[PDB]
UniProtKB/Swiss-Prot annotation, chain A:
This is V-type proton ATPase 116 kDa subunit a 1. The gene is Atp6v0a1. It is found in: Cytoplasmic vesicle, Clathrin-coated vesicle membrane; Cytoplasmic vesicle, Secretory vesicle, Synaptic vesicle membrane; Melanosome. It comes from Rattus norvegicus. V-ATPase is a heteromultimeric enzyme made up of two complexes: the ATP-hydrolytic V1 complex and the proton translocation V0 complex. The V1 complex consists of three catalytic AB heterodimers that form a heterohexamer, three peripheral stalks each consisting of EG heterodimers, one central rotor including subunits D and F, and the regulatory subunits C and H. The proton translocation complex V0 consists of the proton transport subunit a, a ring of proteolipid subunits c9c'', rotary subunit d, subunits e and f, and the accessory subunits ATP6AP1/Ac45 and ATP6AP2/PRR. Interacts with SPAAR. Subunit of the V0 complex of vacuolar(H+)-ATPase (V-ATPase), a multisubunit enzyme composed of a peripheral complex (V1) that hydrolyzes ATP and a membrane integral complex (V0) that translocates protons. V-ATPase is responsible for the acidification of various organelles, such as lysosomes, endosomes, the trans-Golgi network, and secretory granules, including synaptic vesicles. In certain cell types, can be exported to the plasma membrane, where it is involved in the acidification of the extracellular environment. Required for assembly and activity of the vacuolar ATPase. The modification Phosphothreonine is found at T3. Belongs to the V-ATPase 116 kDa subunit family. It comes from the Eukaryota.
């Protein structure tokens, strides 16, 4: 944007998006770790089976 | 016993009356769990008799819906890859796969989808998992000034039921997945915050679908 005020409006959008993304990403990574951990139990059993 | 059930299933009058006994659930469990070709054949024959002989298209749809819900279509697809000494098994599989395919086409109607949303019946009706529906129809949710999205977000605001919540989140996810312009619409409805709350819901089924939905909302500008 062309002015400090329009840049502030864009930055409010960015600050919103980046926080939201990081909150989702934290839970995304945590969920990946649960999925991996569940499978890391199961591989032993599943390999045998 | 199932040969006796198959005899009952032959007559249209009995096909309408016997619905009360929950036959398709029980016989679908047996069809999934039991290996024997005899049992398999006579169940597929009973199912064919139900969808052929029922007095109503609605009774056929009730049976076919119960079969689809009871994972019968997935089992039929596996049974199509399995092979037999009696081709009547394969013809009954093809007949059922076609009649359940028609039931999926009926269920894939945007009017049925709309009716289920308006009725709040967000209960994993197979419409929700119809990739064909979402891929080819997701733009339709914009109708009547975005009325179906207003319902989905209102259900994510109002509902206690984890099924209704998980399903409404799933629907928001598929809406974005097949109509990316819809991200801005969900943001205009505030619905991003509802799925961002429900990713912390007490039920993992809600958490999972809410996580998928917020992830699709957040996937790109």
């Amino acid at each position: 944007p062309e002015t400090p005020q329009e840049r502030k409006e864009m930055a409010s959008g960015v600050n919103t998006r980046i926080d939201d993304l990081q909150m989702v990403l934290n839970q995304t990574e945590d969920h990946r770790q649960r999925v991996l951990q569940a499978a890391a139990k199961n591989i032993r059993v599943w390999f045998i089976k | 016993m199932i040969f006796s059930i198959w005899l009952l299933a032959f007559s249209p009058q009995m096909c309408e009356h016997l619905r009360r006994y929950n036959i398709i659930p029980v016989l679908s469990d047996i069809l999934q769990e039991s290996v024997k070709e005899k049992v398999t054949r006579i169940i597929l024959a009973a199912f064919r008799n139900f969808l052929e002989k029922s007095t109503e298209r609605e009774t056929r749809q009730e049976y076919a819906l119960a079969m689809i819900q009871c994972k019968v279509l997935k089992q039929l697809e596996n049974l199509e890859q399995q092979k037999y000494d009696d081709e009547d098994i394969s013809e009954d599989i093809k007949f059922l796969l076609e009649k359940l395919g028609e039931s999926v086409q009926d269920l894939s109607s945007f009017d049925e989808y709309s009716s289920e949303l308006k009725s709040g019946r967000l209960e994993w009706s197979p419409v929700h998992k119809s990739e064909k529906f979402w891929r080819e129809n997701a733009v339709r949710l914009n109708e009547k000034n975005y009325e179906l999205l207003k319902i989905l977000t209102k259900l994510l605001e109002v509902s206690d039921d984890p099924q209704v919540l998980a399903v409404a989140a799933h629907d928001v996810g598929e809406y974005v997945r097949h109509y990316p312009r819809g991200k801005r619409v969900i943001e205009q409805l505030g619905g991003k915050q509802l799925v961002m709350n429900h990713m912390h819901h007490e039920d993992q089924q809600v958490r999972y679908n809410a996580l998928l939905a917020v992830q699709k909302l957040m996937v790109h500008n």
